[PDB]
Design an enzyme around this catalytic site. Structure first.
Site, PDB file in Angstrom:
ATOM      1  N   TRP A  21      42.440  37.518  40.715  1.00  0.00           N
ATOM      2  CA  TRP A  21      41.985  37.498  42.134  1.00  0.00           C
ATOM      3  C   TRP A  21      42.521  38.603  42.812  1.00  0.00           C
ATOM      4  CZ3 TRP A  21      44.505  34.785  46.430  1.00  0.00           C
ATOM      5  CH2 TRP A  21      44.049  34.671  47.852  1.00  0.00           C
ATOM      6  N   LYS A  22      41.697  39.576  43.466  1.00  0.00           N
ATOM      7  CA  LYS A  22      41.990  40.539  44.394  1.00  0.00           C
ATOM      8  C   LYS A  22      42.297  41.897  43.503  1.00  0.00           C
ATOM      9  CE  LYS A  22      43.337  41.126  47.978  1.00  0.00           C
ATOM     10  NZ  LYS A  22      42.892  41.263  49.693  1.00  0.00           N
ATOM     11  N   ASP A  44      42.160  34.585  33.652  1.00  0.00           N
ATOM     12  CA  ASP A  44      41.701  33.870  34.639  1.00  0.00           C
ATOM     13  C   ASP A  44      40.839  34.787  35.459  1.00  0.00           C
ATOM     14  OD1 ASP A  44      41.647  31.071  36.190  1.00  0.00           O
ATOM     15  OD2 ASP A  44      42.194  32.508  37.438  1.00  0.00           O
ATOM     16  N   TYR A  49      35.476  37.053  42.384  1.00  0.00           N
ATOM     17  CA  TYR A  49      36.268  38.120  42.717  1.00  0.00           C
ATOM     18  C   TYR A  49      35.600  39.363  42.551  1.00  0.00           C
ATOM     19  CZ  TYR A  49      39.595  34.212  41.334  1.00  0.00           C
ATOM     20  OH  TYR A  49      40.305  33.007  41.339  1.00  0.00           O
ATOM     21  N   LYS A  78      34.468  30.527  36.559  1.00  0.00           N
ATOM     22  CA  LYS A  78      34.413  29.604  37.568  1.00  0.00           C
ATOM     23  C   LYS A  78      33.093  29.888  38.378  1.00  0.00           C
ATOM     24  CE  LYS A  78      39.428  30.061  38.756  1.00  0.00           C
ATOM     25  NZ  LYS A  78      39.797  31.505  38.723  1.00  0.00           N
ATOM     26  N   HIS A 111      34.735  25.875  40.970  1.00  0.00           N
ATOM     27  CA  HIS A 111      35.533  26.624  41.876  1.00  0.00           C
ATOM     28  C   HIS A 111      36.230  25.871  42.917  1.00  0.00           C
ATOM     29  CE1 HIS A 111      36.847  31.162  42.561  1.00  0.00           C
ATOM     30  NE2 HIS A 111      37.968  30.061  43.038  1.00  0.00           N
ATOM     31  N   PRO A 212      51.325  30.963  41.807  1.00  0.00           N
ATOM     32  CA  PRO A 212      52.952  30.492  41.539  1.00  0.00           C
ATOM     33  C   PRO A 212      54.080  31.400  42.284  1.00  0.00           C
ATOM     34  CG  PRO A 212      52.047  32.231  39.792  1.00  0.00           C
ATOM     35  CD  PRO A 212      50.876  31.605  40.644  1.00  0.00           C
ATOM     36  N   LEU A 213      53.598  32.478  42.579  1.00  0.00           N
ATOM     37  CA  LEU A 213      54.460  33.210  43.475  1.00  0.00           C
ATOM     38  C   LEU A 213      54.275  33.093  45.001  1.00  0.00           C
ATOM     39  CD1 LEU A 213      54.555  36.545  41.205  1.00  0.00           C
ATOM     40  CD2 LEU A 213      55.772  34.190  40.744  1.00  0.00           C
ATOM     41  N   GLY A 214      53.623  32.249  45.344  1.00  0.00           N
ATOM     42  CA  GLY A 214      53.263  32.012  46.758  1.00  0.00           C
ATOM     43  C   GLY A 214      52.414  33.144  47.325  1.00  0.00           C
ATOM     44  N   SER A 215      51.369  33.788  46.493  1.00  0.00           N
ATOM     45  CA  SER A 215      50.620  34.903  46.683  1.00  0.00           C
ATOM     46  C   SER A 215      51.030  35.655  47.936  1.00  0.00           C
ATOM     47  CB  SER A 215      49.172  34.182  47.244  1.00  0.00           C
ATOM     48  OG  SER A 215      48.021  34.899  46.935  1.00  0.00           O
TER      49      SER A 215
HETATM   50  N1  LIG Z   1      40.702  28.603  41.804  1.00  0.00           N
HETATM   51  C1  LIG Z   1      41.308  28.848  42.839  1.00  0.00           C
HETATM   52  O1  LIG Z   1      40.920  28.561  44.002  1.00  0.00           O
HETATM   53  C2  LIG Z   1      42.410  29.905  42.964  1.00  0.00           C
HETATM   54  C3  LIG Z   1      43.068  30.314  44.218  1.00  0.00           C
HETATM   55  C4  LIG Z   1      43.919  31.367  44.219  1.00  0.00           C
HETATM   56  C5  LIG Z   1      44.372  31.931  42.867  1.00  0.00           C
HETATM   57  N2  LIG Z   1      43.734  31.677  41.900  1.00  0.00           N
HETATM   58  C6  LIG Z   1      43.895  32.197  40.680  1.00  0.00           C
HETATM   59  O2  LIG Z   1      45.401  32.171  40.477  1.00  0.00           O
HETATM   60  C7  LIG Z   1      46.057  33.651  40.057  1.00  0.00           C
HETATM   61  C8  LIG Z   1      47.292  33.658  40.857  1.00  0.00           C
HETATM   62  O3  LIG Z   1      47.539  33.388  42.305  1.00  0.00           O
HETATM   63  P1  LIG Z   1      47.619  34.683  43.317  1.00  0.00           P
HETATM   64  O4  LIG Z   1      46.901  35.952  42.912  1.00  0.00           O
HETATM   65  O5  LIG Z   1      46.953  33.874  44.554  1.00  0.00           O
HETATM   66  O6  LIG Z   1      49.056  35.136  43.683  1.00  0.00           O
HETATM   67  P2  LIG Z   1      50.438  34.953  42.825  1.00  0.00           P
HETATM   68  O7  LIG Z   1      49.953  35.357  41.514  1.00  0.00           O
HETATM   69  O8  LIG Z   1      51.376  33.819  43.277  1.00  0.00           O
HETATM   70  O9  LIG Z   1      51.051  36.469  43.469  1.00  0.00           O
HETATM   71  C9  LIG Z   1      50.366  37.683  43.221  1.00  0.00           C
HETATM   72  C10 LIG Z   1      51.038  38.729  43.927  1.00  0.00           C
HETATM   73  O10 LIG Z   1      52.378  38.816  43.604  1.00  0.00           O
HETATM   74  C11 LIG Z   1      52.697  40.089  43.370  1.00  0.00           C
HETATM   75  N3  LIG Z   1      53.464  39.901  41.798  1.00  0.00           N
HETATM   76  C12 LIG Z   1      53.046  39.480  40.739  1.00  0.00           C
HETATM   77  N4  LIG Z   1      54.307  39.565  40.018  1.00  0.00           N
HETATM   78  C13 LIG Z   1      55.399  39.695  40.669  1.00  0.00           C
HETATM   79  C14 LIG Z   1      56.635  40.080  40.214  1.00  0.00           C
HETATM   80  N5  LIG Z   1      57.096  39.607  39.249  1.00  0.00           N
HETATM   81  N6  LIG Z   1      57.584  40.468  41.409  1.00  0.00           N
HETATM   82  C15 LIG Z   1      57.254  40.571  42.677  1.00  0.00           C
HETATM   83  N7  LIG Z   1      55.886  40.497  42.935  1.00  0.00           N
HETATM   84  C16 LIG Z   1      54.758  40.026  41.881  1.00  0.00           C
HETATM   85  C17 LIG Z   1      51.281  40.690  43.002  1.00  0.00           C
HETATM   86  O11 LIG Z   1      51.472  42.136  43.395  1.00  0.00           O
HETATM   87  P3  LIG Z   1      50.729  43.153  42.363  1.00  0.00           P
HETATM   88  O12 LIG Z   1      49.418  42.636  42.062  1.00  0.00           O
HETATM   89  O13 LIG Z   1      50.477  44.298  43.142  1.00  0.00           O
HETATM   90  O14 LIG Z   1      51.504  43.530  41.199  1.00  0.00           O
HETATM   91  C18 LIG Z   1      50.419  40.254  43.996  1.00  0.00           C
HETATM   92  O15 LIG Z   1      50.659  40.751  45.349  1.00  0.00           O
HETATM   93  C19 LIG Z   1      44.773  34.469  41.023  1.00  0.00           C
HETATM   94  O16 LIG Z   1      44.773  35.848  40.726  1.00  0.00           O
HETATM   95  C20 LIG Z   1      43.549  33.933  40.763  1.00  0.00           C
HETATM   96  O17 LIG Z   1      43.279  34.102  39.360  1.00  0.00           O
HETATM   97  C21 LIG Z   1      42.709  30.617  41.883  1.00  0.00           C
HETATM   98  O1  LIG Z   2      40.051  31.641  43.969  1.00  0.00           O
HETATM   99  C1  LIG Z   2      40.816  32.640  44.494  1.00  0.00           C
HETATM  100  O2  LIG Z   2      41.508  33.368  43.634  1.00  0.00           O
HETATM  101  C2  LIG Z   2      41.011  32.841  45.754  1.00  0.00           C
HETATM  102  O3  LIG Z   2      40.130  32.541  46.730  1.00  0.00           O
HETATM  103  C3  LIG Z   2      39.010  33.190  46.975  1.00  0.00           C
HETATM  104  C4  LIG Z   2      38.725  34.558  46.453  1.00  0.00           C
HETATM  105  C5  LIG Z   2      37.804  35.141  46.634  1.00  0.00           C
HETATM  106 CL1  LIG Z   2      37.716  36.795  45.990  1.00  0.00          CL
HETATM  107  C6  LIG Z   2      36.603  34.615  47.635  1.00  0.00           C
HETATM  108  C7  LIG Z   2      36.795  33.470  47.816  1.00  0.00           C
HETATM  109  C8  LIG Z   2      37.846  32.690  47.726  1.00  0.00           C
HETATM  110  C9  LIG Z   2      38.225  31.242  48.167  1.00  0.00           C
HETATM  111  O4  LIG Z   2      38.123  30.746  49.190  1.00  0.00           O
HETATM  112  N1  LIG Z   2      38.330  30.360  46.900  1.00  0.00           N
HETATM  113  C10 LIG Z   2      38.608  28.780  47.041  1.00  0.00           C
HETATM  114  C11 LIG Z   2      39.014  28.060  48.491  1.00  0.00           C
HETATM  115  C12 LIG Z   2      40.297  27.796  48.606  1.00  0.00           C
HETATM  116 BR1  LIG Z   2      41.666  28.696  47.377  1.00  0.00          BR
HETATM  117  C13 LIG Z   2      40.851  27.259  49.765  1.00  0.00           C
HETATM  118  C14 LIG Z   2      39.903  26.697  50.838  1.00  0.00           C
HETATM  119 BR2  LIG Z   2      40.496  25.669  52.189  1.00  0.00          BR
HETATM  120  C15 LIG Z   2      38.549  27.036  50.589  1.00  0.00           C
HETATM  121  C16 LIG Z   2      38.124  27.606  49.266  1.00  0.00           C
HETATM  122 BR3  LIG Z   2      36.170  27.780  49.309  1.00  0.00          BR
END
Ligand SMILES: NC(=O)c1ccc[n+]([C@@H]2O[C@H](COP(=O)([O-])OP(=O)(O)OC[C@H]3O[C@@H](n4cnc5c(N)ncnc54)[C@H](OP(=O)(O)O)[C@@H]3O)[C@@H](O)[C@H]2O)c1
Ligand SMILES: O=C(O)COc1cc(Cl)ccc1C(=O)NCc1c(Br)cc(Br)cc1Br
Length: 316
Positions: A21-22, A44, A49, A78, A111, A212-215
């Site tokens: 994501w992103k 994932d 995305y 997803k 999703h 897991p890292l608080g995004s």
């Molecule tokens: N199903 C859903 O609705 C949903 C919602 C949110 C996320 N997700 C999935 O879960 C994944 C993980 O969650 P997330 O992307 O929201 O945030 P996250 O993994 O908690 O954190 C990502 C951020 O942490 C940085 N980072 C990574 N490793 C680090 C480290 N060792 N030390 C310091 N900073 C570090 C990254 O920077 P850099 O990238 O610049 O290295 C990025 O800015 C997503 O990419 C996505 O695939 C799913």
């Molecule tokens: O799933 C992710 O990685 C992050 O969430 C998104 C990323 C993109 Cl590029 C576009 C949309 C979302 C998104 O909003 N996903 C799910 C969602 C979440 Br997480 C929380 C709420 Br509240 C609503 C929704 Br829809």
């Protein structure tokens, strides 16, 4: 490299995965390449995305050059909620599969449980930014997704951002062919999800921890928002093991048998994030970390609370 969590289907899901994501175009290809080199097998992905085509590039490259075989990769995507109408499920999936350049997906997830206005406007919303609902439900979607499994295009199905109420609704639907193998939800020490994990596990459903890292680079981050990586008590446990806070935050899920998907495009961090199989958090350290629960969501993109199956109101 990583250990595994056994699914109800007996498939083995690598307990650490790469989030995408992103992850920007022109970085995500190199991120995936570095991750596979570092031993990641679980990637994932999502339609929403809009980077699956570059992820596919990287996967194909690594397979061709014999760094890895498809059977050892575990690829997850997803279905976005504007595609819950039956024919749109197929088309969205096809685009995802074509983008990823694969012949099958390991898991395909719903999703988000709420249906949005059907179509290729991914974020339909009113003037105020509230999401516009659609008639098709996640049960409509699940029906179409079950076909994909029937055809061998997807090995297993799952859900994301479901409360135990939506999973019960899924599990209790008469005529269900396939059950969800995982529920992918936000999870970290500020949102420890104790009741949901317990529920899911009791039903043979794994949990996958996102953010897991608080995004930390979510743009909607307000400076008063809690920062896990900077948390003194988290850093204290990391210091004790001569590890990073990120490594402690990732290892936390592993010890609960919860799959975890840290996102990064930075090669050092990608490598750092999978170096979590050479230390153990003690029972007391796990207990301390668990006590940090704030029921705090980083990923509450809301303005959909007004629609039927909103998951974040329930207790779990
Ligand atoms: N199903 C859903 O609705 C949903 C919602 C949110 C996320 N997700 C999935 O879960 C994944 C993980 O969650 P997330 O992307 O929201 O945030 P996250 O993994 O908690 O954190 C990502 C951020 O942490 C940085 N980072 C990574 N490793 C680090 C480290 N060792 N030390 C310091 N900073 C570090 C990254 O920077 P850099 O990238 O610049 O290295 C990025 O800015 C997503 O990419 C996505 O695939 C799913
Ligand atoms: O799933 C992710 O990685 C992050 O969430 C998104 C990323 C993109 Cl590029 C576009 C949309 C979302 C998104 O909003 N996903 C799910 C969602 C979440 Br997480 C929380 C709420 Br509240 C609503 C929704 Br829809």
């Amino acid at each position: 490299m990583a250990t595994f969590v056994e699914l109800s289907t007996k498939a083995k899901m690598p307990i650490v995965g790469l989030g995408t994501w992103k992850s920007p175009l022109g970085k995500v290809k190199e991120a995936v390449k570095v991750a596979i080199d570092a031993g990641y097998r679980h990637i994932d992905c999502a339609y929403v995305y809009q980077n699956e085509h570059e992820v596919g590039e990287a996967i194909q490259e690594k397979i061709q050059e014999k760094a890895v075989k498809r059977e050892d990769l575990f690829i997850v995507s997803k279905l976005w909620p504007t595609f819950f109408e039956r024919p749109l499920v197929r088309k969205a999936f096809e685009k995802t599969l074509k983008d990823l350049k694969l012949s099958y997906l390991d898991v395909y997830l719903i999703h988000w449980p709420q249906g949005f206005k059907s179509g290729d406007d991914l974020f339909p919303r009113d003037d105020k930014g509230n999401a516009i609902g659609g008639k098709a439900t996640f049960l409509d979607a699940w029906e179409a997704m079950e076909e994909l499994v029937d055809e061998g295009l997807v090995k297993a199905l799952g859900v994301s951002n479901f409360s135990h109420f939506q999973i019960e609704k899924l599990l209790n639907k008469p005529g269900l062919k396939y059950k969800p193998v995982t529920n992918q939800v936000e999870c970290h020490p500020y949102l420890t999800q104790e009741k949901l994990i317990q529920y899911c596990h009791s039903k043979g459903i794994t949990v996958t921890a996102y953010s897991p890292l608080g995004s930390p680079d979510r743009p909607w981050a307000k400076p008063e928002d809690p920062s896990l990586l900077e948390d003194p008590k988290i850093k204290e446990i990391a210091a004790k093991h001569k590890k990073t806070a990120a490594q402690v935050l990732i290892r936390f899920h592993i010890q609960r048998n919860v799959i975890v998907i840290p996102k990064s495009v930075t090669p050092a961090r990608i490598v750092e994030n999978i170096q979590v199989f050479d230390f153990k958090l003690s029972d007391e350290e796990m207990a301390t970390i668990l006590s940090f629960n704030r029921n705090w969501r980083a990923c509450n993109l809301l303005q959909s609370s007004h629609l039927e199956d909103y998951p974040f109101n329930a207790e779990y």
